[PDB]
Amino acid sequence: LGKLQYSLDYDFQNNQLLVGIIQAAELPALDMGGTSDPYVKVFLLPDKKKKFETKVHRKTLNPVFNEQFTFKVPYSELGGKTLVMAVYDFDRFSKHDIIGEFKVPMNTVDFGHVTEEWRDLQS
Amino acid sequence: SDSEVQLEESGGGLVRPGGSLRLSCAASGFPFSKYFMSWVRQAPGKGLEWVSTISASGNYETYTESVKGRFTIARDNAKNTLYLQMNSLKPEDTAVYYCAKGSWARDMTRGQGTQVTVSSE
Ligand SMILES: [Ca+2]
Numbered sequence: 507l508g509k510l511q512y513s514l515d516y517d518f519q520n521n522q523l524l525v526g527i528i529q530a531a532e533l534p535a536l537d538m539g540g541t542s543d544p545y546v547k548v549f550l551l552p553d554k555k556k557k558f559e560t561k562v563h564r565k566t567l568n569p570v571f572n573e574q575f576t577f578k579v580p581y582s583e584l585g586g587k588t589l590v591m592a593v594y595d596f597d598r599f600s601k602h603d604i605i606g607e608f609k610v611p612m613n614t615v616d617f618g619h620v621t622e623e624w625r626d627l628q629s
Numbered sequence: 630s631d632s633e634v635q636l637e638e639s640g641g642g643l644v645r646p647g648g649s650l651r652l653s654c655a656a657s658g659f660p661f662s663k664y665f666m667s668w669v670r671q672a673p674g675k676g677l678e679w680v681s682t683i684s685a686s687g688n689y690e691t692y693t694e695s696v697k698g699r700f701t702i703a704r705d706n707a708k709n710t711l712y713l714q715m716n717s718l719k720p721e722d723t724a725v726y727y728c729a730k731g732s733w734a735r736d737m738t739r740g741q742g743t744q745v746t747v748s749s750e
Binding site: 513515517519520524526528529570572573574576620622 | 630659660663664665682683684685686688689690691731732733
């Protein structure tokens with residue numbers, strides 16, 4: 507289902523969870539002609555009160571989004587969240603099919619380190 | 630809320646077509662090294678438009694189609710500074726250039742701007 511590169515950071519000064527969506531690679535092809543039109547939907551479980559979407563990157567299986575989204579999350583609540591990064595195939599007329607997703611449970615993220623990480627997308 | 634953010638551009642000026650210019654931007658009031666940063670611009674007669682974004686790490690750079698290959702974005706997280714190297718400048722590149730906090734959003738926090746005019750005179 508491809509791979510996603512992202513970076514997770516927390517601005518303690520402003521109580522901001524910072525989600526960098528760098529790129530995806532080796533995505534499956536969902537359009538005729540052997541390509542896709544990927545974008546990423548980004549939101550937090552379990553409350554789901556704010557969703558972001560990257561730009562749509564047309565006709566590519568290796569989109570470089572280079573976008574960053576911020577969520578106001580009080581520090582004491584951050585460990586109860588799960589970050590969802592869901593990669594969709596855009597289509598002009600039909601429903602947008604999900605390609606894959608990667609979820610990050612915050613109750614294991616320490617922010618003891620901030621890195622750019624690759625993950626295999628999952629169903 | 631970016632009430633504390635301060636962004637200060639410099640480096641603008643008049644350029645002949647084909648010439649080069651380097652902008653810089655001093656950033657204060659927020660953990661600069663954690664944020665993606667962007668250059669955006671507003672040309673005479675057009676809306677604000679995205680020019681380039683650099684990741685917080687400085688490792689990933691993206692560029693609007695009309696400046697690809699000609700502009701380079703860079704950052705120094707130790708000195709909280711953002712740079713835009715502009716080579717092979719075109720008259721269409723005339724605009725107020727702004728350094729901006731985050732990846733592209735029409736309402737993103739921006740500096741005061743620096744004027745870049747590309748002219749044959
Ligand atoms: Ca598609």
